[PDB]
Amino acid sequence: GPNANPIPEHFFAPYIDMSLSVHKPLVEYAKLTGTKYFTLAFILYSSVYNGPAWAGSIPLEKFVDEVRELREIGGEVIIAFGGAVGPYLCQQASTPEQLAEWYIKVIDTYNATYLDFDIEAGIDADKLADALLIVQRERPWVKFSFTLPSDPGIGLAGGYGIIETMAKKGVRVDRVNPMTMDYYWTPSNAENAIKVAENVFRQLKQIYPEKSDEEIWKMIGLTPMIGVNDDKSVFTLEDAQQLVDWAIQHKIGSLAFWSVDRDHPGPTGEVSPLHRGTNDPDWAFSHVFVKFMEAFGYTF
Amino acid sequence: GPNANPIPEHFFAPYIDMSLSVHKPLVEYAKLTGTKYFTLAFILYSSVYNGPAWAGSIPLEKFVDEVRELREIGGEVIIAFGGAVGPYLCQQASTPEQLAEWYIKVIDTYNATYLDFDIEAGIDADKLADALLIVQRERPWVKFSFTLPSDPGIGLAGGYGIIETMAKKGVRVDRVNPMTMDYYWTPSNAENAIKVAENVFRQLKQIYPEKSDEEIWKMIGLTPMIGVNDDKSVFTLEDAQQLVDWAIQHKIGSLAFWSVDRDHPGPTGEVSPLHRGTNDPDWAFSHVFVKFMEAFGYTF
Structure with a gap:
């Protein structure tokens, strides 16, 4: 379109914390990371603007x-x-109408075609669903993604109830993106990310029993935290390569990671928003993840 | 005064992150915390205003x-x-004159009588000193505080060089406030905060050997991170009470902590800017720290 472009069937859109002072223009990140698709994070409720703000x-x-x-x-x-x-926004909004108004304001400001709801706290799933029913009715071309906490022993946690609610309410669910990170009792590696993926596959089959295996995998995305995680475990470049190859083989819908500004080497094990606490060269993880898109036609 | 009030000789002015959406009016925090003095954080360089901004x-x-x-x-x-x-601002400023101009703009906007320079990154101390020489000349009634990283085995770290520079160049140093937190190799407790204080005492005596022990202690302030620290150790309410009693006994100049909006109970061990990851009731730490100020005349 004139002011919106197509996103690949199999895409890689890593997270960029837009609030960082080191923030580079998106076009520069495209050149450096190799991907021209990004997930811009995060919109929250601002008391100052009494509405959406980064x-x-x-x-x-x-x-x-x-x-x-x-x-x-x-x-x-x-x-x-x-x-x-x-x-x-879904916590502050007093009604689904107000919440929808805020989401739509964001959509209209950026001519957005895809929204991601990264839910890591307790929320009113019913209110969120009612708001999204309004959003999809008023802006029918906008896709909805749900990014939620996960664990290799169970797949989605409380987030599973959120998806169950969306499905029952009739809210479109284009992407279910478990955050394969910070399990604390077991390391954030490729093996565990794959276990999460398999569990989420089973969970989605329960919600959508009429969907084929391929349709379920297409709904799934995986998002690890590169390098050192908050629990001190490390998602290595080797883990990245293993996960990418697994993702290509299973033809899942997407991959992403936290975060673009962390794709730089830094002091071993140090947790920071500006580097990943490993010694891999600048943009090393980005380049490995881009291979996922390249297998399916992407070139930049 | 007609446009500014006196800050107690021995005070407690905890940090408030002014950018948070949860931000309540300062008068409300005063009623809840028990202290009517706060350190407003943080002023940084803004490209939009090409100068100071929160x-x-x-x-x-x-x-x-x-x-x-x-x-x-x-x-x-x-x-x-x-x-x-x-x-x-001290990193972005092209000259000490421009830096001084920015600091003075902040002073004049708020009729400030006390500034705190929280330096947690490498800076040009000589340039900062040249700028502050201008500031103290033009606004001789404004006190200067320096808040810096610390460790119980050394006192101030690289920040010590900043204080040495200020003293050598003739810049007033009204308060040296080590951040008694995040040591990683040893816990952020009262015992270590006290060790830091003792080391800072030695460090200041080495710069100002002519000052009495009482004068040195009055120059010192201590700032812990309440509850769970970034390195996952915990500065408990018991630690708070122990530190307050030690501070009263040694008649140090001040106490503060990070942060006002974190003085709430929350999921154990979780680091957040909205709670402290401990089970103590709302404002529990604030109430303990206020005792330090009460010992020297404060009543609210």
């Missing part, structure tokens, strides 16, 4: 021009809400 | 009314620069 305090429209520039090279974005810390 | 994006003048309201109940504030993330 990190709950930065002007919503701040990155409109950056997105325009990215689209000029064929890139596209997914706008993410939520994250590890609130206040979420 | 969190590097929020308009500088945004909280002028809140400060005026706090002053109506006898309260006062310390304006903090820097913090864990940049860009710092």
